[PDB]
Amino acid sequence: TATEKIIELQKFYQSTNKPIYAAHPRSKYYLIPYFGLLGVSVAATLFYTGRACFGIKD
Amino acid sequence: EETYEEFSQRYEKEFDEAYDLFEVQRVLNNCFSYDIVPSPAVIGKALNACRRVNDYATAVRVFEGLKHKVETKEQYDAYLEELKDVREELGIDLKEELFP
Amino acid sequence: MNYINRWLFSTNAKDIAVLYFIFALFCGLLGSIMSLILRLELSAPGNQILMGNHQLFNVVATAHAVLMVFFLVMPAAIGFFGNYLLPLMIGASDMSFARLNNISFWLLPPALVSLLASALIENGAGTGWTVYPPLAGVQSHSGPSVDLAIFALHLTSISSLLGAINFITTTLNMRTIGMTMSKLPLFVWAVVFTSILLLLSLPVLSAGVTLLLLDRNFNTSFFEPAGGGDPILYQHLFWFFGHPEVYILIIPGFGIISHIVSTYSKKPVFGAIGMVYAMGSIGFLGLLVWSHHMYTVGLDVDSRAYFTSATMVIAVPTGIKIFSWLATLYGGSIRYTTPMLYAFAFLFLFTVGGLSGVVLSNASLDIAFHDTYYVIGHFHYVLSLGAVFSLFAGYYYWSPLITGLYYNNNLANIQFWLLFIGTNVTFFPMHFLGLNGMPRRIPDYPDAFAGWNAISSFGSLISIISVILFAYVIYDQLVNGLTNKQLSTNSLFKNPDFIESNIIFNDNSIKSSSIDFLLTSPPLPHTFNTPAIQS
Amino acid sequence: SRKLILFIVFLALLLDNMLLTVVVPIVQVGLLFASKATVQLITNPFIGLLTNRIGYPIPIFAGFCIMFVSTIMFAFSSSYAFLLIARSLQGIGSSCSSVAGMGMLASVYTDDEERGNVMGIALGGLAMGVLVGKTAPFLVLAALVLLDGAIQLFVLQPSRVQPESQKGTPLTTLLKDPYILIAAGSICFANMGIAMLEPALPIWMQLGVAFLPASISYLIGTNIFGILAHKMGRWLCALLGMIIVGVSILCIPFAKNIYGLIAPNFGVGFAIGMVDSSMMPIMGYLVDLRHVSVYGSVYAIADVAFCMGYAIGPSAGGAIAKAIGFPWLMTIIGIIDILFAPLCFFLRSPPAK
Amino acid sequence: MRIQNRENLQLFPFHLVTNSPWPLTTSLALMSLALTLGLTMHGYIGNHLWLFLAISLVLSSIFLWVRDVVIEGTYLGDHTIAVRKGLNIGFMLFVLSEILIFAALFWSYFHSAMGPTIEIGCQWPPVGITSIKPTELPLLNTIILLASGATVTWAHHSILYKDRQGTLVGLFITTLLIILFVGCQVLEYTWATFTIADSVFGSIFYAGTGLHFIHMVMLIVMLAICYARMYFYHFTSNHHLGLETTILYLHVLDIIWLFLYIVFYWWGC
Amino acid sequence: QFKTATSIAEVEGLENLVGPGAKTGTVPTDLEQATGLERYELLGKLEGIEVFDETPLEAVRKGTMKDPILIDSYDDYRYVGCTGVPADSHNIEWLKPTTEKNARCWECGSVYKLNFL
Amino acid sequence: FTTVKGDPAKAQAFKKHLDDVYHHSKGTTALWKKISYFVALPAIALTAVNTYFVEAEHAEHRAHNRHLSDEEWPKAYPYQNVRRVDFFWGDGDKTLFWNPDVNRHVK
Amino acid sequence: DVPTPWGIFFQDSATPNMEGIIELHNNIMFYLVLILTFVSYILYTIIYNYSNATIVHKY
Amino acid sequence: DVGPYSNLPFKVKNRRVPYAVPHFLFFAIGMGIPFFACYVQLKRSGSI
Numbered sequence A: 001t002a003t004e005k006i007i008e009l010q011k012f013y014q015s016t017n018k019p020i021y022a023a024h025p026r027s028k029y030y031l032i033p034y035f036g037l038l039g040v041s042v043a044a045t046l047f048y049t050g051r052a053c054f055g056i057k058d
Numbered sequence B: 001e002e003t004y005e006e007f008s009q010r011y012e013k014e015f016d017e018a019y020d021l022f023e024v025q026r027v028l029n030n031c032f033s034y035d036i037v038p039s040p041a042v043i044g045k046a047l048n049a050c051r052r053v054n055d056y057a058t059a060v061r062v063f064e065g066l067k068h069k070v071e072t073k074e075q076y077d078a079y080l081e082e083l084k085d086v087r088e089e090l091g092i093d094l095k096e097e098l099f100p
Numbered sequence C: 001m002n003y004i005n006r007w008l009f010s011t012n013a014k015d016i017a018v019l020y021f022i023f024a025l026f027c028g029l030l031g032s033i034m035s036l037i038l039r040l041e042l043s044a045p046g047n048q049i050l051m052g053n054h055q056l057f058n059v060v061a062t063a064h065a066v067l068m069v070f071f072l073v074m075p076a077a078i079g080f081f082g083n084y085l086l087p088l089m090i091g092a093s094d095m096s097f098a099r100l101n102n103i104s105f106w107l108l109p110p111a112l113v114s115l116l117a118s119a120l121i122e123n124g125a126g127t128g129w130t131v132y133p134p135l136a137g138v139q140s141h142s143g144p145s146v147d148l149a150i151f152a153l154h155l156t157s158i159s160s161l162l163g164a165i166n167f168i169t170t171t172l173n174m175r176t177i178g179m180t181m182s183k184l185p186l187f188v189w190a191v192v193f194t195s196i197l198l199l200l201s202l203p204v205l206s207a208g209v210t211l212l213l214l215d216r217n218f219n220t221s222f223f224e225p226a227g228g229g230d231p232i233l234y235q236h237l238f239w240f241f242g243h244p245e246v247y248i249l250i251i252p253g254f255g256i257i258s259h260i261v262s263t264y265s266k267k268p269v270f271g272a273i274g275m276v277y278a279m280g281s282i283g284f285l286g287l288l289v290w291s292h293h294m295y296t297v298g299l300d301v302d303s304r305a306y307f308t309s310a311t312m313v314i315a316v317p318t319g320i321k322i323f324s325w326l327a328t329l330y331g332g333s334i335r336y337t338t339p340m341l342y343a344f345a346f347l348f349l350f351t352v353g354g355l356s357g358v359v360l361s362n363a364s365l366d367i368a369f370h371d372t373y374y375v376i377g378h379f380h381y382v383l384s385l386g387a388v389f390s391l392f393a394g395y396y397y398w399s400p401l402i403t404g405l406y407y408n409n410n411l412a413n414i415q416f417w418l419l420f421i422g423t424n425v426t427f428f429p430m431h432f433l434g435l436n437g438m439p440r441r442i443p444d445y446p447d448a449f450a451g452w453n454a455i456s457s458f459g460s461l462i463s464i465i466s467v468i469l470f471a472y473v474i475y476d477q478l479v480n481g482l483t484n485k486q487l488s489t490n491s492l493f494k495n496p497d498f499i500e501s502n503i504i505f506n507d508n509s510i511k512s513s514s515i516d517f518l519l520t521s522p523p524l525p526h527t528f529n530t531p532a533i534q535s
Numbered sequence D: 001s002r003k004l005i006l007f008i009v010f011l012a013l014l015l016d017n018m019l020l021t022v023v024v025p026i027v028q029v030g031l032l033f034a035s036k037a038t039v040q041l042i043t044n045p046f047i048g049l050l051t052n053r054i055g056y057p058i059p060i061f062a063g064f065c066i067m068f069v070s071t072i073m074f075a076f077s078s079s080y081a082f083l084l085i086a087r088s089l090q091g092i093g094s095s096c097s098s099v100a101g102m103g104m105l106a107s108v109y110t111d112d113e114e115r116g117n118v119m120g121i122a123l124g125g126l127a128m129g130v131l132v133g134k135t136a137p138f139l140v141l142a143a144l145v146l147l148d149g150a151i152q153l154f155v156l157q158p159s160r161v162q163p164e165s166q167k168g169t170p171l172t173t174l175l176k177d178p179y180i181l182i183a184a185g186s187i188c189f190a191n192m193g194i195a196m197l198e199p200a201l202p203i204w205m206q207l208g209v210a211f212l213p214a215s216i217s218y219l220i221g222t223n224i225f226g227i228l229a230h231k232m233g234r235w236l237c238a239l240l241g242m243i244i245v246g247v248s249i250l251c252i253p254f255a256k257n258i259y260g261l262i263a264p265n266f267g268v269g270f271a272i273g274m275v276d277s278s279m280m281p282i283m284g285y286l287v288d289l290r291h292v293s294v295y296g297s298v299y300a301i302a303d304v305a306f307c308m309g310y311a312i313g314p315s316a317g318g319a320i321a322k323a324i325g326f327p328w329l330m331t332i333i334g335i336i337d338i339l340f341a342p343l344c345f346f347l348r349s350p351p352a353k
Numbered sequence E: 001m002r003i004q005n006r007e008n009l010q011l012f013p014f015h016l017v018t019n020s021p022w023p024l025t026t027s028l029a030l031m032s033l034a035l036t037l038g039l040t041m042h043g044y045i046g047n048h049l050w051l052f053l054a055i056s057l058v059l060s061s062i063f064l065w066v067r068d069v070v071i072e073g074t075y076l077g078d079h080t081i082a083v084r085k086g087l088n089i090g091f092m093l094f095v096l097s098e099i100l101i102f103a104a105l106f107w108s109y110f111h112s113a114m115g116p117t118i119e120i121g122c123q124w125p126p127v128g129i130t131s132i133k134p135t136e137l138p139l140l141n142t143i144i145l146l147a148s149g150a151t152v153t154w155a156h157h158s159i160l161y162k163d164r165q166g167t168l169v170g171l172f173i174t175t176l177l178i179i180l181f182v183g184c185q186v187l188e189y190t191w192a193t194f195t196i197a198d199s200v201f202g203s204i205f206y207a208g209t210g211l212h213f214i215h216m217v218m219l220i221v222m223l224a225i226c227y228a229r230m231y232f233y234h235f236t237s238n239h240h241l242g243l244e245t246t247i248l249y250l251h252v253l254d255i256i257w258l259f260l261y262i263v264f265y266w267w268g269c
Numbered sequence F: 001q002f003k004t005a006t007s008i009a010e011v012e013g014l015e016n017l018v019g020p021g022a023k024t025g026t027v028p029t030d031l032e033q034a035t036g037l038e039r040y041e042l043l044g045k046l047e048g049i050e051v052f053d054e055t056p057l058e059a060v061r062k063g064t065m066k067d068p069i070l071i072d073s074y075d076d077y078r079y080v081g082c083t084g085v086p087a088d089s090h091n092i093e094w095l096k097p098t099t100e101k102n103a104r105c106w107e108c109g110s111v112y113k114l115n116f117l
Numbered sequence G: 001f002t003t004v005k006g007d008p009a010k011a012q013a014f015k016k017h018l019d020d021v022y023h024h025s026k027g028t029t030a031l032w033k034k035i036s037y038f039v040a041l042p043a044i045a046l047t048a049v050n051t052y053f054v055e056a057e058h059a060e061h062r063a064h065n066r067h068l069s070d071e072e073w074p075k076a077y078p079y080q081n082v083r084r085v086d087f088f089w090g091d092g093d094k095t096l097f098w099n100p101d102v103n104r105h106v107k
Numbered sequence H: 001d002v003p004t005p006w007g008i009f010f011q012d013s014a015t016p017n018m019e020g021i022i023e024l025h026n027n028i029m030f031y032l033v034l035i036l037t038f039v040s041y042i043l044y045t046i047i048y049n050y051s052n053a054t055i056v057h058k059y
Numbered sequence I: 001d002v003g004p005y006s007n008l009p010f011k012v013k014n015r016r017v018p019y020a021v022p023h024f025l026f027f028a029i030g031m032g033i034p035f036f037a038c039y040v041q042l043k044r045s046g047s048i
C-alpha cells in the first residue's frame, strides 16, 4: 500500500524457504544477465590465454 | 617469599583436610614441586592421610619420590631411620623389599 | 547441491583452512621440483641439463621464489593455522567477516594461473624476485610475462589485506565473557602483530609495482634516467615492504613453538608479558630499517652508520625469546615426541642462521658479502629451517585434533632425520663458496667452485625423499588411522605424573591451558552454543 | 659530516621531552612537576655565553653525562631534598644539551633554505618523547649514535678549547631589539595553551588516546612546513598558525565527550608545528641581517620562551580551574591567541643594518 | 540468561551469515580483468570490448554484495550493538590503508622535487612545461569541497531532530556539489599544456590527482545510495550506518585535497 | 508475522517481534522499525534486563563434592576456566562439566556441577 | 527457575540518552543551515563569476593556436614526448585527453 | 687473486681496506662463537639431566 | 553425520576407485608440471 512496505517485506524475508538473493520476484532480472555474461567473460579469457601460448596473435 | 617453617605448616594443614584419593594425590603432587624438600613431619601426616582414604600403592610411592628428591644416599637413609615407627605400625613396605 | 553450498559457497572459518592446506601443499611441491631443477644444473662445470639457455634458469629461480614466499608459507601460516585456531582459542563461533575470508581464499587460484602463464608466453620473466626497473623494461623483457607476474602480486596483496583486517576486527570485540586483552594466548598476539604489519607495508609495494607497470606500458618514466627519474627510488619503495615481509613469515612460527614448549615440557612459559613485549619491539623495529639491503648503491657515509646501529638492536628482543624458551625447558620433564623434535631443531638452527645476520649488518663487511652466496646461506638457515620446521611441528601437533586420525610415529621420525641431514648438507658449504667469492644468480661458474657444488647437490635428493615419505605419512594417516593410536603412547596429549595413578588418569585425561584440546576431535560445525566462562 | 649533528640534536630533544613529560610511568605536586622547567629557565642564558667561550661540542656531551648521572640518582632516591636536587641536575643538563645543539645546527648550515628544513626535522623529537615498552633497545640505539658522534668529534680530529673568531652581541643588546622578542612571544603564547590544557583535563574528564593525535599531527606539520615556509613567507605561516591554535582551542568547550576531542587536538598540534618550524629559523635569520653572527644567546632566548609555558602552566592553571573553571580559561587563552595573530605581519621585511 | 523463553532465540550477539555465491564470482571477474588487461596491451586480442565487460562485471559484483548487506540489516534485523562496532572498526581500517597509498606517492614527489637530476636542467617545473596557475579553477574546487563538507553536517543534524525534508535536500545539494568537482577537473585535463609522458613532473602530477578522481566517483555513488535509501524509509533516527561511513570518507578526501593543493599546485620552487 | 510484544514476557520467538509501522512524512523511531535480535536487546534495555550477560565466574568460594559450584547452561556441556579462589592464584585451566560427570581442577581442586535450564 | 527482574536505575539512563539527542540538536541544526546558506553560497557564486571571466579571456588565445604551422610551435626539448611504447588505443601518438588546440607532437 | 678449489676462507689481500675487513670479521666471530657455545651447552645440560624426570618445578 | 571422515572435501572409504589413484595423481601432477614448462620453453628456443 503506502511507502511503509517495511512492515510487509519483513514478514516475507522471514519465513521464505528460499535463499535471500533469489527470494523476491525481481531477482531474475539481476541474476540472469550477470551469470549469462560471466560465463562468456570467463570463456573468452581461457581461449585467448591458450591461443597465445601457441604464438598466435590478432 | 615463603620460608621453611610456613611451608611445613601450610602443607600439614592441607594434608589434614583431604577427603578423597584425588585430593591426597593432588596435595602430594604439588608438595614435591618446590625447591624445599618436605619435612619428616609432613610425610608423617601424608601416610595417615593415605590411611584414612585406604590406599596402599600411594603409601609406597611416597618413599620412592624421596629417593629422587634427595641429593645423596646418606640423607635418604637419614630419612628412613626416623620414619620407622610410622612404617612398622601401619605396615608399609618399600619397593626394594617387595621387588614388584 | 549440498556439495556446492558447503565447500564452494562457504561461511565457516574452519572449512576454509583445509582448502588452504590443500593449496599450500601443491604450491610447495611445485617450487621444490623447481629447486631440484636448479640444483641439478649447478652440479659440475659446464652446461648440463638446460642445454645453453640462461633464460629458463632465471625464470625457474623467480618462480621458485614467488611460489614459496607468497603461495606456501603465508597460506599455511595464515589460512590453515590462523583461520582455524584463533576463533577456538579466543572462544568465538566464526570470524567477523566470513565472506571476506571466502574471497581471501578464492583470490589465490587466479593468482596461480597468471604466474604459471607468465612462464609459457615468451622467453619468460627472468627479472629475479626483486623486479628491478631498468632490466624489467621494454628493452630486455618485451612481452606479456612481467605484466602477468606483477598482477599475481596484486591479488595476493588484496587477499592478505582482507585477511588482516578480519583478524584485527575479530580479536577486538568477539572474545568470551571473561577475557581481557592481557589473558590472550601468544598465538593470537602473533597473528595480531603480523596483521598490523600487513596493513602498514602493502600499500608501498602496490604503489611501486603499479608505477613500474605505468613505466613499462604507458611511457611515464618514473624510474628511467633519461627523463628525470632514478631507479633507486623503486628500491626504497620495494624494501619498505621487504623487511616487514620477512617478519610476517616468522612471527606466527614463534608462538607455535611456545605452545609445544609449554606442552611436552610440563611448565608454563617463562615471562609471557616479556614475550609479547618482545614481539612488539621486533614488529616495530622492522619498519625503521630497510636500507641494509642497499649498502653498495652509493649512499652517504652518515646514513650507513645509522643503519648499522638500527639493525644490531633487533638482536636484543630475540635473545629474550630464546633464553625464555631455554628457561621454560630447563626445570620440567621432557618427553621426545615428534613435535618436540622439530621444536629442539628450531632453537639451534635459527640461532646459527641469525648470528650470520650480525656479520652482514655492518656496512664495512657488506662490501665483501653483497650479491654472494653467504646471503643465500644466511637466509636458507632461517627460511627453510625456521619456518618450514615450525609448519611441520604445527601439523604434527594439531592434526589429530582437527582430523581425528592418528599417524605412524616411526615414519615421521625417519622423515625428520632425513630433512635434518639433507638440509644441513645442502646449505652449509654455501658459506664457504660465499667466503671464497662466488656471486649470485649465475648458471655457470669457474672451475674452482666445483667441489662444494658437488656436495650441495647431494642433500637436495635426500630432502625430496623426505617429502615423498611425508606423502606416505599422510596416506597412512588417512587410511587405517583409527588403529594407529595403540601402537605408541605419542597419541596421549599429556603423560601421567608420578603420583597420579592410571585409574585416576583415565577418568581425568586432558589437562590444558587453552580451549583447543578439550573439544570433541572432530570439531563441531557450530562449536559454541552457550558462551564460555573465564574467571 | 653535517647530518650527524642533526641526529645528535634530534636525540637531545627526544631525551629532553622524555625526561620532562614521562616521569609517572617511568601543593607538593605542583612544585615537584615544575622543578625542572624553572631551573632550566634560570640556567638557559648562561650556556649561551659559555658556548662563545669554550665552543660548541663539549657542553652537549657534558649535558648528556649530567643527565645520565642525574637520572641514575633519581632511580634510587627516597628523600624529598635529594629528589629535588636530582631533578635540578636533570634540568641543568637538559638546558645545556638543547641550546648548544640548536646553536651548532645554526652554525653549520649557513644557507637559509636548508636551515628551515633541517630544524623542521630536528623539532620533531619534541613529540616522540611524548609518544614514548621495554625501552632498552632505544637507549642502546641512542648510545650507538652518540658513540659515532664522539668518535667523529673527539677521536679522528683533535679538538682544543678554540674560542670563536668573532665576538657576539650581549644578551641585553638582543633584548633591546623588538623583533627577537616579538618572535619569541609567538612560541610562548602558542605553547601556553597546550601547557595549561594538560592538568585540567583529568578535572574535566583513555589518557594516551587523548594526547596521541597531537603527537601524530606535530611530526607531519613540522616536516612539511619546514620546507614550504620559504616560498610562502614565514610571517604568513605564523599568522595562520596562531589563528588555527585559537580556533581549535575554542572548539574544546563545545565538545561534551572524550571522543569529540580527537578532531580539535589534530587542529592543535599541526598548527603549533606550523608555529614552530616557521618561526625558529627566522630568529637565526634576523641576527644575520642586523647583528653579528653568534647563535648561542638567541637560541637561549628561544628556549626561554619555549620553557616559560611549561614553567608557568600547571601552577596557574590549577588556580584558575579552581577559581573560574575550564571553559572560560580556554575562552580567554583562545581570544589571546587569536588577538596576538594580527601583529605577526610586522616580520615581512625588517630593516637591515 | 534466566529470562523465561530464552532457548528460542540466539544466545550470543553475533551474525551467522547464510551461504552466498559472490566471493567466487568476484574472483572469476578479477581473473578475466587481469588476464585481459595483460593481453590487450601487447596484441593478442585486438577488440577492446572484453575489458569493458570485465570492469562492468566487477562493479556489478560489488553492487550484488551490497544488496545482501542491506537486506540483512533493514529486513532480517541482525545488526546488534556489537556488529555495528565491528563494521565501524572495519571501515576505519580500510580508510587507514587507503591513506598510505598517498604517502608513497607524496614520497615519490619529494624524492625528485628536492634534488632533481642532471638530465632535467636542475629546476622544478622544468624548461618547456608551463604549470597550472593556482588562482584559477583549483580554487573553485577547494571552495566547493569546503561547502560540501558543511552541507552534510546539516544532513546528519536533521536526521537526529526528525526532519525529513532537510535530510533529502542536503544530500541532494552535496551530490550536485561533487559532480561539479569532476566536471571542473575533467575541464582542467583538457586545457592543459603537459601530458602524462612529458616529464617526471607530468607523470607524478597525473598520478596523484588521478587516484583522487577515482576516489571521488565513489562518493557520488555512495551518496546516490544514501539519498535513495532515505527516500524509501530505511533510516531511523538512531540506526543509520550508511551515512556515518559516507561522512568519514568525505572529510578524509577534503583533508587529502588540502595537501594536494599546497604541494602539487602552489609549491614549485 | 503475528502479535507484537510490548515487554519481554510476551516474546516466544522471532514471530512476536515485527512491530507497528511509521507514518508518511516522519523519520521513524526504533520502536516502530526493528525485527530480529536487535529489537530483543531494545526491549531488554528499556526495562533494565541485560539479555547478553558479560559477568565472569564466581571467584569467592571453593568447591567441595558435597557443595559444588553450579554452572548454568542450556546444553549438556559448558567450558569453564578456573584461575583461583583469590581470582588470580591458580593459572588458567579449562574444564568441561557434563550432566554425567563433574570436573575437579587438578591444581587447586574446585568441583563444578552443571545446572540444565 | 526464577526470572531476573529489571533494575529501574538502568532504565532511566537509556531513556535520558535518547531524549538528549533530540535536545542539543535543536540549535546546531539551525546554525549549520545558516553556515550553509549565507557563507557557502556567495563564496561559490563570487568565485564562479570571477573564474568565468578569467578563463573566458583565455578561451580566445587558444583558438588561434591551431592554424600555427609546425615551424612556429614552441621548441621541443629532450624528455619532452616519450614514445618508446606505442599506445594500444587508436594511433600510438595520442593519450586519453588530447586536444590539438593546446598540444601537438612535432616530428 | 684467483679462487682456490676447496676454499674455506677469504682470498689474500693487497689493500689496507680488505685487511681491515678481515680484522673486523675476526673480531666479531669471537663473540658469536661464545654465544653459540653457551646456547649449545645449555641444551646439552637440558637433554642430559632433565629428560624423563619425575619432579617438575612448575612454579 | 559429524564424525572422523566428515570434514574432508574428498571421500576416503567405501569408494569404487581405490584412494591410492587420487592420492598418487595429485603428487604426480604437482611434481610433473614444472618439467613440462621447461620442456615447452626449451623446444620453443631451438635446443632439443
Ligand code: HEA
Residues within 6 Å of the ligand: C246, C247, C249, C250, C292, C293, C294, C311, C312, C314, C315, C316, C318, C319, C322, C350, C351, C353, C354, C355, C357, C358, C360, C361, C362, C366, C369, C370, C371, C375, C378, C379, C382, C383, H035
Ligand atoms: C627469514 C626472515 C629473516 C630473518 C629472521 C632475518 C633476520 C635478520 N636479518 Fe635479514 N634477511 C632476510 C630475511 C630475514 N632476515 C632475507 C630473505 C635476506 C636475503 C635478502 C635477499 O636477497 O632478498 C636477508 C638478508 C639480510 C642481510 C644481508 C643484506 C645483503 O645481502 O647485503 C642483512 C644485513 O644487514 C640482514 C639483516 C638481518 C638481521 C640483523 C637479522 C637478525 O634479526 C638475526 C637475529 C638473530 C639473532 C641475533 C639470534 C639471537 C641470539 C642471541 C642469543 C642474541 C645474542 C646477541 C648478540 C648476537 C649481540 N638480513
Ligand code: HEA
Residues within 6 Å of the ligand: C024, C025, C028, C029, C031, C032, C035, C036, C038, C039, C061, C062, C064, C065, C068, C069, C073, C076, C128, C129, C130, C376, C380, C383, C384, C388, C391, C392, C395, C426, C440, C441, C442, C460, C463, C467
Ligand atoms: C621460501 C623460502 C625458501 C625455501 C623453502 C627454499 C628452498 C630451497 N632453496 Fe632457496 N630460495 C629462496 C628461499 C627459499 N628456498 C629464495 C627467496 C630464492 C630466490 C633468490 C633469488 O631469486 O635471488 C631461492 C633460490 C634458491 C636457489 C637459486 C639461487 C639463485 O638462483 O641465485 C637455490 C639453489 O641452490 C636454492 C636452494 C634451495 C633448496 C635446495 C631448497 C629446498 O629446501 C627445496 C626443498 C623443499 C623442502 C625441503 C620443503 C618442502 C615443503 C613442504 C612440502 C612442506 C609443506 C608444509 C606443510 C605440510 C605445512 N634456493
Ligand SMILES: [Cu+2]
Residues within 6 Å of the ligand: C243, C292, C293
Ligand atoms: Cu633485511
Ligand SMILES: [Zn+2]
Residues within 6 Å of the ligand: F082, F083, F084, F090, F093, F105, F107, F108, F109, F110
Ligand atoms: Zn583451579
